[PDB]
């Protein structure tokens, strides 16, 4: 008995918390940016959406989102902001989006 592939399951749990946290941040920030687009606030929506983007690629640096899985999140996010901003557009910050 007592194989020290047990050490592997130990690290498994450590990495579980790392991936789970960053993902929890992505979701919590993404929805925050969209709630502002839907409520019209253009500057705050953008300034937030940029930090969601950064947190996404940062999660793709390691083993959390490593693939184009991260670009999937970025793609779906930036669409809904610009579209939800289309009720009284006025895209103030215009940081993350293109002219």
Partner RNA sequence: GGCUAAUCCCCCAUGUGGACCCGCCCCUUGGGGUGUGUCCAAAGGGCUUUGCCCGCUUCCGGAUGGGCCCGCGUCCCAUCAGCUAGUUGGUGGGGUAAUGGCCCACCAAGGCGACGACGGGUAGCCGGUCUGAGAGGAUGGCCGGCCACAGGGGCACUGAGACACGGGCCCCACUCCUACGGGAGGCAGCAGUUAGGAAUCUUCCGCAAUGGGCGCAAGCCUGACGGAGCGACGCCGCUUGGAGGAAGAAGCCCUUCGGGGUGUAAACUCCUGAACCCGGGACGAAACCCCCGACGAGGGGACUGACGGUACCGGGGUAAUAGCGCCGGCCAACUCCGUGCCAGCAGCCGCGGUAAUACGGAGGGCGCGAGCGUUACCCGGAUUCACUGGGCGUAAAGGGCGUGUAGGCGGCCUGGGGCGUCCCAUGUGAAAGACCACGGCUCAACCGUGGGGGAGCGUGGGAUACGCUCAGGCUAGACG
Partner RNA sequence: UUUUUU
Partner RNA sequence: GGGAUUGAAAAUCCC
Residues that bind Mg ion (CB under 5 A): 28
Q: How far apart are CA 40 and CA 20, in angstroms?
A: 31
9 contacts which partner out of Mg ion, RNA, none, CB within 5 to 8 A by kind?
Answer: RNA
CB-facing half-sphere around the CA of 68: CA atoms within 13 A:
2
Phi, psi of 33 (to 5 degrees): -65, -35
Give residues in contact with RNA (CB under 7 A): 1, 3, 5-6, 8-9, 11-13, 15-16, 18-20, 50, 53-58, 61-72, 74-76, 78-79, 82, 94-99
91 contacts which partner out of Mg ion, RNA, none, CB within 5 to 8 A by kind?
Answer: none
């Amino acid at each position: 008995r007592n194989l020290s592939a047990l050490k592997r399951h130990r690290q498994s749990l450590k990495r579980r918390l790392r991936n789970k946290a960053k993902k929890s941040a992505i979701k919590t920030l993404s929805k925050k940016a969209i709630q502002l687009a839907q409520e019209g606030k253009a500057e705050e929506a953008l300034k937030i959406m940029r930090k969601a983007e950064s947190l996404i690629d940062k999660a793709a640096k390691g083993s959390t989102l490593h693939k184009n899985a991260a670009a999937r999140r970025k793609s779906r996010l930036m669409r809904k902001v610009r579209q939800l901003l289309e009720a009284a557009g006025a895209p103030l910050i215009g940081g993350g989006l293109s002219a």
